[PDB]
Short mmCIF file of C-alpha atoms in Angstrom, two decimals:
data_model
loop_
_atom_site.label_atom_id
_atom_site.label_comp_id
_atom_site.label_asym_id
_atom_site.label_seq_id
_atom_site.Cartn_x
_atom_site.Cartn_y
_atom_site.Cartn_z
CA UNK R 150 112.19 33.59 146.62
CA UNK R 151 110.94 30.03 147.10
CA UNK R 152 112.71 26.49 146.37
CA UNK R 153 110.83 24.51 144.24
CA UNK R 154 111.51 21.98 141.57
CA UNK R 155 114.33 19.35 141.11
CA UNK R 156 116.53 18.64 138.22
CA UNK R 157 117.36 15.36 136.79
CA UNK R 158 119.75 14.44 133.42
CA UNK R 159 118.11 11.27 132.05
CA UNK R 160 114.49 11.01 132.65
CA UNK R 161 112.74 7.71 134.05
CA UNK R 162 109.55 6.76 132.76
CA UNK R 163 106.18 5.19 134.28
CA UNK R 164 105.80 2.26 131.52
CA UNK R 165 108.43 0.17 130.26
CA UNK R 166 109.11 -2.88 128.23
CA UNK R 167 109.74 -6.47 129.63
CA UNK R 168 110.66 -9.73 127.80
CA UNK R 169 110.83 -13.27 128.79
CA UNK R 170 112.46 -15.87 126.74
CA UNK R 171 112.88 -19.34 126.88
CA UNK R 172 115.70 -21.56 126.49
CA UNK R 173 116.37 -24.14 123.83
CA UNK R 174 116.30 -21.25 121.28
CA UNK R 175 117.94 -18.37 122.85
CA UNK R 176 121.77 -17.25 121.67
CA UNK R 177 123.18 -15.12 124.66
CA UNK R 178 126.68 -15.05 122.69
CA UNK R 179 126.17 -12.54 119.87
CA UNK R 180 125.09 -9.10 120.98
CA UNK R 181 126.57 -7.36 117.65
CA UNK R 182 125.49 -5.80 114.19
CA UNK R 183 127.74 -2.91 113.44
CA UNK R 184 129.83 -0.14 115.15
CA UNK R 185 128.43 3.42 115.50
CA UNK R 186 124.96 1.46 115.28
CA UNK R 187 125.41 -0.97 118.05
CA UNK R 188 125.24 1.91 120.60
CA UNK R 189 122.28 3.13 118.81
CA UNK R 190 120.23 0.52 117.92
CA UNK R 191 121.17 -2.33 120.61
CA UNK R 192 119.64 -2.58 123.55
CA UNK R 193 117.16 -2.45 121.28
CA UNK R 194 118.35 -5.66 119.40
CA UNK R 195 119.27 -7.24 122.78
CA UNK R 196 115.64 -7.15 124.49
CA UNK R 197 114.56 -8.40 121.21
CA UNK R 198 117.00 -11.65 121.11
CA UNK G 940 112.55 14.36 77.53
CA UNK G 941 113.93 15.26 80.71
CA UNK G 942 116.43 17.67 82.56
CA UNK G 943 120.27 17.12 83.88
CA UNK G 944 122.64 18.67 85.91
CA UNK G 945 124.91 21.45 85.55
CA UNK G 946 126.57 24.74 86.89
CA UNK G 947 126.61 28.16 85.54
CA UNK G 948 130.10 29.76 87.41
CA UNK G 949 127.80 33.12 87.11
CA UNK G 950 129.47 34.00 83.90
CA UNK G 951 126.61 35.94 83.11
CA UNK G 952 127.47 39.13 83.91
CA UNK G 953 130.65 39.67 81.78
CA UNK G 954 131.06 42.13 84.63
CA UNK G 955 135.03 42.22 85.89
CA UNK G 956 135.97 42.32 90.04
CA UNK G 957 132.98 39.62 90.84
CA UNK G 958 132.71 36.03 90.51
CA UNK G 959 136.29 35.25 91.33
CA UNK G 960 135.71 31.51 92.78
CA UNK G 961 134.94 29.34 89.97
CA UNK G 962 132.73 25.79 89.46
CA UNK G 963 135.13 23.33 91.47
CA UNK G 964 134.69 24.99 94.75
CA UNK G 965 130.94 23.61 94.85
CA UNK G 966 131.98 20.10 93.91
CA UNK G 967 134.62 19.96 97.16
CA UNK G 968 131.53 21.53 99.53
CA UNK G 969 129.12 18.68 98.05
CA UNK G 970 131.81 16.20 98.62
CA UNK G 971 132.06 16.89 101.96
CA UNK G 972 129.83 14.97 104.39
CA UNK G 973 127.95 17.05 106.62
CA UNK G 974 129.28 19.64 109.29
CA UNK G 975 127.43 20.73 112.67
CA UNK G 976 127.76 24.19 114.50
CA UNK G 977 129.71 22.23 117.28
CA UNK G 978 132.18 20.55 114.51
CA UNK G 979 132.92 23.57 112.56
CA UNK G 980 133.64 25.29 115.89
CA UNK G 981 136.00 22.67 116.48
CA UNK G 982 137.61 22.39 113.16
CA UNK G 983 138.06 26.26 113.43
CA UNK G 984 140.07 25.24 116.45
CA UNK G 985 142.39 22.95 115.18
CA UNK G 986 143.70 24.69 111.93
CA UNK G 987 144.13 27.63 114.08
CA UNK G 988 146.26 25.76 116.96
CA UNK W 199 166.95 0.45 82.92
CA UNK W 200 164.16 -1.92 84.15
CA UNK W 201 161.88 -0.09 85.90
CA UNK W 202 158.13 -1.26 86.25
CA UNK W 203 156.09 1.98 87.17
CA UNK W 204 157.09 5.66 87.47
CA UNK W 205 154.18 7.72 88.62
CA UNK W 206 153.53 11.40 90.05
CA UNK W 207 151.87 12.54 92.88
CA UNK W 208 151.98 14.79 95.79
CA UNK W 209 155.37 15.69 97.39
CA UNK W 210 156.42 13.69 100.26
CA UNK W 211 158.52 16.89 101.23
CA UNK W 212 156.83 19.95 100.84
CA UNK W 213 153.64 18.98 102.98
CA UNK W 214 155.20 17.28 106.13
CA UNK W 215 154.27 16.47 109.59
CA UNK W 216 155.58 20.01 110.52
CA UNK W 217 151.70 20.96 109.46
CA UNK W 218 149.68 17.84 110.27
CA UNK W 219 150.03 16.18 106.68
CA UNK W 220 150.88 12.62 106.54
CA UNK W 221 150.97 10.63 103.06
CA UNK W 222 152.22 7.35 103.41
CA UNK W 223 149.60 5.40 101.27
CA UNK W 224 149.33 7.88 98.61
CA UNK W 225 146.50 9.80 99.66
CA UNK W 226 146.72 13.16 102.06
CA UNK W 227 145.62 11.85 105.62
CA UNK W 228 145.26 14.67 108.51
CA UNK W 229 144.90 12.90 111.76
CA UNK W 230 141.95 15.61 113.18
CA UNK W 231 139.85 18.02 111.40
CA UNK W 232 136.08 17.04 111.29
CA UNK W 233 135.20 14.82 113.82
CA UNK W 234 132.46 12.87 115.87
CA UNK W 235 132.65 14.97 118.98
CA UNK W 236 130.49 13.20 122.43
CA UNK W 237 132.22 9.87 120.71
CA UNK W 238 135.60 8.99 120.76
CA UNK W 239 137.57 9.07 117.53
CA UNK W 240 137.93 6.31 115.27
CA UNK W 241 141.19 4.16 114.69
CA UNK W 242 140.85 4.79 110.80
CA UNK W 243 138.36 7.39 109.18
CA UNK W 244 137.26 8.05 105.81
CA UNK W 245 136.92 11.59 106.98
CA UNK W 246 140.53 11.95 107.63
CA UNK W 247 141.19 12.30 103.75
CA UNK U 1137 122.60 -14.04 88.79
CA UNK U 1138 124.24 -10.54 89.03
CA UNK U 1139 123.90 -9.43 92.34
CA UNK U 1140 124.60 -6.01 93.62
CA UNK U 1141 124.51 -5.36 97.42
CA UNK U 1142 124.35 -1.79 98.48
CA UNK U 1143 123.71 -2.21 102.39
CA UNK U 1144 126.68 -4.61 103.50
CA UNK U 1145 125.42 -3.88 107.14
CA UNK U 1146 122.36 -5.83 107.76
CA UNK U 1147 123.07 -9.44 106.28
CA UNK U 1148 123.57 -11.97 108.54
CA UNK U 1149 126.60 -14.19 108.75
CA UNK U 1150 124.99 -17.39 106.92
CA UNK U 1151 123.67 -14.98 104.02
CA UNK U 1152 126.46 -13.94 103.23
CA UNK U 1153 128.54 -17.59 103.16
CA UNK U 1154 125.57 -18.32 100.69
CA UNK U 1155 126.62 -15.45 98.63
CA UNK U 1156 130.03 -16.06 98.77
CA UNK U 1157 129.55 -20.14 98.02
CA UNK U 1158 127.06 -19.32 94.98
CA UNK U 1159 129.82 -17.39 93.30
CA UNK U 1160 132.51 -20.16 93.62
CA UNK U 1161 129.95 -23.30 92.75
CA UNK U 1162 127.57 -21.87 90.51
CA UNK U 1163 129.21 -19.13 88.99
CA UNK U 1164 127.37 -15.91 90.54
CA UNK U 1165 128.57 -12.34 89.83
CA UNK U 1166 128.12 -10.41 93.17
CA UNK U 1167 128.87 -6.68 93.88
CA UNK U 1168 129.57 -4.21 96.73
CA UNK U 1169 129.75 -0.55 96.74
CA UNK U 1170 130.08 0.91 100.68
CA UNK U 1171 133.32 -0.55 101.11
CA UNK U 1172 136.28 1.90 100.46
CA UNK U 1173 139.73 1.14 99.74
CA UNK U 1174 143.11 2.83 98.23
CA UNK U 1175 144.67 0.78 95.74
CA UNK U 1176 148.58 0.56 94.92
CA UNK U 1177 150.02 -1.36 92.30
CA UNK U 1178 152.57 -4.17 92.92
CA UNK U 1179 155.86 -5.07 91.01
CA UNK U 1180 155.74 -9.11 89.99
CA UNK U 1181 158.77 -9.99 91.77
CA UNK U 1182 158.84 -11.03 95.93
CA UNK U 1183 154.96 -11.66 95.49
CA UNK U 1184 152.04 -10.29 97.79
CA UNK U 1185 153.16 -8.55 101.61
CA UNK U 1186 149.24 -8.52 103.02
CA UNK U 1187 146.20 -11.19 102.21
CA UNK U 1188 142.70 -10.38 103.33
CA UNK U 1189 139.66 -12.66 103.38
CA UNK U 1190 136.64 -13.02 101.96
CA UNK U 1191 134.86 -13.12 105.40
CA UNK U 1192 136.14 -10.04 106.54
CA UNK U 1193 134.85 -8.35 103.34
CA UNK U 1194 131.74 -8.79 104.22
CA UNK U 1195 131.98 -7.57 107.95
CA UNK U 1196 134.06 -4.50 107.40
CA UNK U 1197 132.79 -0.99 109.04
CA UNK U 1198 131.14 1.00 106.61
CA UNK U 1199 133.33 4.30 106.98
CA UNK U 1200 136.76 2.21 107.39
CA UNK U 1201 139.05 2.22 104.68
CA UNK U 1202 141.83 -0.45 104.37
CA UNK U 1203 144.18 -0.75 101.75
CA UNK U 1204 144.12 -4.17 99.32
CA UNK U 1205 147.24 -4.40 96.68
CA UNK U 1206 146.88 -5.28 93.22
CA UNK U 1207 149.63 -7.37 91.13
CA UNK U 1208 150.97 -5.64 88.26
CA UNK U 1209 153.26 -8.36 86.88
CA UNK U 1210 153.58 -7.04 83.32
CA UNK U 1211 157.39 -7.56 82.68
CA UNK U 1212 157.84 -11.51 84.16
CA UNK U 1213 160.23 -13.82 82.38
CA UNK U 1214 158.52 -16.77 81.46
CA UNK U 1215 159.78 -20.31 82.04
CA UNK U 1216 162.39 -22.27 80.19
CA UNK U 1217 161.60 -25.18 78.02
CA UNK U 1218 162.44 -27.97 80.04
CA UNK U 1219 160.22 -28.06 83.60
CA UNK U 1220 157.80 -29.80 85.54
CA UNK U 1221 154.21 -28.80 84.05
CA UNK U 1222 150.72 -27.58 86.06
CA UNK U 1223 147.52 -28.88 87.43
CA UNK U 1224 144.47 -26.98 87.82
CA UNK U 1225 146.09 -23.82 89.16
CA UNK U 1226 145.11 -20.13 90.33
CA UNK U 1227 141.52 -18.79 90.91
CA UNK U 1228 141.20 -14.98 91.57
CA UNK U 1229 138.47 -13.70 93.99
CA UNK U 1230 138.36 -9.55 93.54
CA UNK U 1231 138.11 -6.96 90.85
CA UNK U 1232 138.18 -3.21 90.96
CA UNK U 1233 135.68 -1.33 88.88
CA UNK U 1234 136.96 1.78 89.08
CA UNK U 1235 139.08 2.13 87.51
CA UNK Z 791 159.65 68.24 129.01
CA UNK Z 792 159.56 64.64 127.49
CA UNK Z 793 158.48 63.95 124.32
CA UNK Z 794 158.07 60.19 123.39
CA UNK Z 795 159.95 58.43 120.00
CA UNK Z 796 157.46 57.48 117.64
CA UNK Z 797 159.08 53.83 116.95
CA UNK Z 798 157.59 52.36 119.93
CA UNK Z 799 153.84 53.10 119.24
CA UNK Z 800 153.82 52.57 115.06
CA UNK Z 801 155.40 48.83 115.34
CA UNK Z 802 153.43 48.52 118.56
CA UNK Z 803 149.79 48.71 116.30
CA UNK Z 804 151.33 47.31 113.41
CA UNK Z 805 151.85 43.78 115.22
CA UNK Z 806 148.13 43.87 116.67
CA UNK Z 807 146.92 44.46 113.25
CA UNK Z 808 148.83 41.20 112.33
CA UNK Z 809 147.47 39.32 114.89
CA UNK Z 810 144.07 40.15 113.82
CA UNK Z 811 144.40 39.21 110.20
CA UNK Z 812 146.30 36.09 110.70
CA UNK Z 813 143.70 35.32 113.65
CA UNK Z 814 140.64 35.55 111.65
CA UNK Z 815 141.82 33.64 108.61
CA UNK Z 816 141.37 30.19 109.47
CA UNK Z 817 137.15 31.22 110.17
CA UNK Z 818 137.02 32.99 106.96
CA UNK Z 819 138.54 30.29 105.08
CA UNK Z 820 136.75 27.34 106.03
CA UNK Z 821 133.55 29.40 105.95
CA UNK Z 822 134.27 30.14 102.59
CA UNK Z 823 134.29 26.39 101.42
CA UNK Z 824 130.99 25.38 102.67
CA UNK Z 825 129.16 28.41 100.76
CA UNK Z 826 129.89 27.12 97.33
CA UNK Z 827 129.28 30.30 95.49
CA UNK Z 828 129.84 31.29 91.58
CA UNK Z 829 127.93 28.54 91.07
CA UNK Z 830 123.73 27.77 90.40
CA UNK Z 831 123.12 24.35 89.85
CA UNK Z 832 120.45 24.60 86.86
CA UNK Z 833 118.51 22.27 84.64
CA UNK Z 834 117.60 22.37 80.78
CA UNK Z 835 114.26 21.07 79.71
CA UNK Z 836 114.59 20.08 75.77
CA UNK Z 837 112.06 21.38 73.59
CA UNK Z 838 111.46 18.24 71.85
CA UNK Z 839 113.45 18.44 68.43
CA UNK Z 840 116.72 17.02 68.35
CA UNK Q 248 93.13 -0.53 145.82
CA UNK Q 249 95.33 1.17 148.20
CA UNK Q 250 98.51 0.14 145.95
CA UNK Q 251 96.83 2.23 143.09
CA UNK Q 252 96.42 5.41 146.03
CA UNK Q 253 100.28 5.19 146.06
CA UNK Q 254 100.74 5.26 142.50
CA UNK Q 255 98.23 8.20 141.61
CA UNK Q 256 100.00 10.15 144.88
CA UNK Q 257 103.46 9.41 143.12
CA UNK Q 258 102.39 11.13 139.51
CA UNK Q 259 100.46 13.76 141.42
CA UNK Q 260 103.72 15.62 143.69
CA UNK Q 261 105.82 14.96 140.45
CA UNK Q 262 108.33 18.08 140.01
CA UNK Q 263 111.35 17.06 137.61
CA UNK Q 264 112.86 19.86 135.14
CA UNK Q 265 114.98 18.15 132.49
CA UNK Q 266 118.57 19.40 131.94
CA UNK Q 267 120.72 17.83 128.77
CA UNK Q 268 123.25 15.72 130.05
CA UNK Q 269 124.90 13.47 127.25
CA UNK Q 270 124.84 13.98 123.63
CA UNK Q 271 126.62 12.76 120.40
CA UNK Q 272 126.73 13.98 117.22
CA UNK Q 273 127.46 10.76 114.89
CA UNK Q 274 129.87 11.49 111.87
CA UNK Q 275 127.38 11.14 109.07
CA UNK Q 276 128.91 8.08 107.32
CA UNK Q 277 129.72 5.43 109.90
CA UNK Q 278 125.84 4.84 110.45
CA UNK Q 279 124.75 3.39 107.30
CA UNK Q 280 121.55 4.44 105.86
CA UNK Q 281 118.27 3.28 107.27
CA UNK Q 282 119.35 4.54 110.55
CA UNK Q 283 120.76 8.27 108.73
CA UNK Q 284 117.14 8.86 107.85
CA UNK Q 285 115.85 8.18 111.14
CA UNK Q 286 117.74 10.37 113.20
CA UNK Q 287 118.03 14.51 113.16
CA UNK Q 288 121.49 15.87 114.24
CA UNK Q 289 122.45 14.47 117.74
CA UNK Q 290 120.87 12.10 120.00
CA UNK Q 291 121.56 11.52 123.61
CA UNK Q 292 123.43 8.56 124.97
CA UNK Q 293 120.73 6.47 126.81
CA UNK Q 294 118.47 5.79 123.44
CA UNK Q 295 115.94 3.19 124.85
CA UNK Q 296 113.91 0.21 123.55
CA UNK Q 297 111.85 0.82 120.62
#
């Protein structure tokens, strides 16, 4: 009757996490912990290096 | 003095023509991981084709 | 005369690749039945048993 | 001590080395569970065909079952009376407890 | 007047009754296993004594 | 103060329906133990940070 709502697939969000590390301590080489977990956990471990 | 864990096989009918299957079918089911709705649908399809 | 071990198991003939059954290791391993769906399959899984 | 690892997925590489070094240099008894394997007996003659490492036994994926062969060697002719001796030999590192 | 022979219809349905029985077999089987059946999983408490 | 009047405006006229685009039904074994307890059945594909 009247066109209204729009549909997405993956929602965005207003508030998000932002991290700022410093060097001398960081190790950007290792990004792995498991197999089917490295896709369920991290980025939830790569934003908390 | 605690309990334990056993199985009945439904022998407490002594009435024939029922209780055809036995103990071992449950052991296989519990041995299985867990099957989701879409996994069962996939499993039915594969054995059929 | 001079045989080390003589063991018994599933027949390599009766259950053949014509029905999906494959057993080189001694364990009846099928390729697909129950699997993670949205995610791609693995090179080797315990579910294949 | 008598160790017993249940979660062999969260341990860091340094912890695994400590575990795999204290067994050697302090006689620790360690244990694994999530590891799944298919075992098949092997004849004395010819030897082994495949050998794994003690570092890979600590990083193997939860649901990936590899096979590790066990040496039988029940029937094997002993050496002759005249031959060179030996000096502090074989150390074995893994044992099945199924059995 | 033409009378249709009974051969073409008796065997026609006989094969259709075969497809259904062979098609419904997998889901009546894999479904059967995950039901358990003919079991209970019970527990027995000892009234002291022995 | 003008910038906040743009944030408040953007949320006010926000009409978005949510279709389910992506998922995975992970096999109960590969994910170890702590993570098994955490998740119920299926998850999406873009699990964020927590």
